[PDB]
């Protein structure tokens, strides 16, 4: 497939990485009874670890000659790997940043601003917190309006 | 004249109304709005109880008044002619409260009108014989009234305990007074 690398749903090495990890935990689980506490953990981990492999095979990631899932970072077979998450960040980071902007400016005009950086006006911040939900629509409109730059 | 002699009545009860014997432990009659309503429910309630306890006895002077539910025009056929007739009548009484005079005039035969009258005591048509005189009657009315109201709950708890009606439950009491109480 892309860069000649196999899909994880098919690839042998990936499916032999399944086996090795599981068959590490089944060599442990022998040393305990089935009713016991740690046996429920070494079964639950296995169940989870065997579920995990299944859920990349269903996701359809590209696995190499290594047996490990590699990622795709440009265009549309593998959007969700990077292209979607990427926006996730720029949003929540932009959220944090713009809330922080609206806080510092909102304090600025109040005799001594430095006190509000330490004894933070919580009920100011928690109102700006929610306001900062719709930030790109404000951020754009502020770049337009021309209050964004000194 | 007081429910508990030597008491002082509550402030709101002044012996104006008929059968005001200074009784409102929970200042129910405290607000004039509510006390105007409660006046009516206490008339009508007794009027229905007097009418009903009068019935229970005289219908059994027989079979269980309680299982009379089981009696020529189907159930839903009869519940209709009640509903519309009762809805008709009850609304018109309820307008006389909504505004004290609003209804008195025969919508058909508007020639005939019910003369100006105190609430819940309508008269005109409804006082043909103009019998015994002035308030005193309204004080028999609420007295005889309450006694009838009480007796009914009696008649009910009397059914729901003995199985028999009123006159049989009494005949049972006479037979063994010492034995046939609630305390046995």
């Amino acid at each position: 497939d892309i860069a000649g690398l196999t899909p994880c749903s098919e690839s042998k090495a990936y499916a032999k990485l399944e086996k090795k990890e599981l068959k590490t935990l089944e060599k442990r689980l022998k040393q305990y009874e089935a009713d016991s506490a740690p046996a429920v953990a070494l079964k639950a981990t296995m169940e989870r670890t065997k579920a995990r492999f299944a859920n990349y095979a269903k996701a359809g990631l590209l696995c190499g000659n290594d047996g490990l899932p590699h990622l795709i970072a440009d265009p549309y077979g593998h959007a969700g790997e990077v292209f979607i998450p990427t926006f996730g960040f720029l949003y929540v980071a932009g959220y944090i940043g713009y809330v922080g902007r609206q806080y510092l400016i909102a304090v600025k005009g109040e005799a001594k601003p430095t006190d509000k950086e330490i004894i933070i006006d919580v009920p100011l911040a928690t109102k700006l917190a929610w306001q900062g939900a719709g930030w790109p629509l404000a951020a754009v409109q502020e770049l337009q309006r021309g209050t964004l730059l000194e | 004249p007081l429910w508990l002699p030597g008491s002082t009545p509550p402030a709101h009860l002044k012996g104006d109304l008929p059968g005001d014997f200074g009784f409102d432990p929970l200042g129910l009659g405290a607000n004039a709005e509510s006390l105007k309503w409660f006046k009516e429910s206490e008339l009508v309630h007794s009027r229905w109880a007097m009418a009903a306890v009068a019935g229970i006895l005289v219908q059994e002077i027989d079979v269980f008044w309680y299982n009379a539910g089981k009696e020529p025009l189907g159930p839903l056929g009869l519940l209709a002619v009640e509903f519309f007739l009762m809805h008709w009548v009850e609304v018109r009484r309820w307008q006389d409260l909504r505004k004290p005079g609003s209804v008195d005039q025969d919508p058909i035969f508007s020639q005939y009108k019910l003369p100006p009258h105190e609430v819940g005591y309508p008269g005109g048509v409804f006082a043909p014989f103009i019998p015994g005189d002035l308030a005193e009657l309204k004080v028999k009315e609420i007295k005889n009234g309450r006694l009838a109201m009480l007796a009914f709950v009696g008649f009910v708890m009397a059914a729901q305990v003995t199985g028999k009606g009123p006159i049989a439950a009494l005949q049972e009491h006479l037979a063994d007074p010492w034995g046939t109480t609630i305390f046995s």
Partner: protein
């Protein structure tokens, strides 16, 4: 704030203002307050008449062909299963011609509603005109050829209309549940009325 001395539906209650006893059949019923804005009373007042006169016609169209067909005279069917497929033209056309002839008459009537004297004269035989009524919904002339001149009369119209409009709602309702003609519903009710209410049948 509300007329005192005119027809009420809850005697003792309050007509609201906008129902002056001006329009025909005002006893001042508008619980939801749909006639508030006097623009919207103008429409509804007319809307009522149209809807009224279609019902009163229709309900006669419904009942009579049963009243006669049971006495036994010559074509008589069910007022819903009637329009199925049994006519000299097809469904399609009979609508087309219907929609055409109306679209004309209605835009004529509508202009008269919009402007009170706009359409009162023939535009072909232009000496022919219906008189200066000045009363949309009550246009007159041809439309009053035997010449009943009255307030009396304009009540009797909307009272019959309100009653007919229902009767038709009933016909929809009654058919949809029971599944026979409304004179057959009234027959079975009259045979044993008590054991045949709605509540019985529901």
């Amino acid at each position: 704030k509300r007329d005192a001395a005119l027809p009420s539906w809850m005697p003792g209650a309050d007509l609201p203002g906008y129902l002056n006893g001006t329009l025909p059949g005002d006893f001042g019923f508008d619980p939801l307050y749909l006639g508030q804005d006097p623009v919207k009373l103008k429409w509804y007042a007319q809307a009522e008449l149209m809807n009224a006169r279609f019902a009163m016609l229709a309900v006669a169209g419904i009942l009579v062909p049963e009243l006669l067909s049971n006495i036994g005279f010559g074509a008589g069917v069910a007022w819903y299963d009637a329009g199925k497929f049994e006519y000299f033209a097809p469904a399609s056309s009979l609508f087309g011609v219907q929609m055409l002839l109306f679209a004309w008459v209605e835009i004529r009537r509508y202009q008269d509603f919009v402007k009170p004297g706009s359409a009162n004269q023939d535009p072909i035989f232009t000496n022919n005109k219906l008189p200066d009524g000045n009363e949309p919904g009550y246009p007159g002339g041809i439309f009053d050829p035997f010449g009943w001149s009255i307030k009396s009369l304009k009540l009797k119209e909307i009272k019959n209309g309100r009653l007919a409009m229902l009767a038709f709602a009933g016909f929809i309702g009654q058919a949809y549940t029971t599944g026979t003609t409304p004179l057959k519903n009234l027959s079975t009710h009259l045979a044993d009325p008590w054991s045949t209410t709605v509540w019985q049948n529901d």
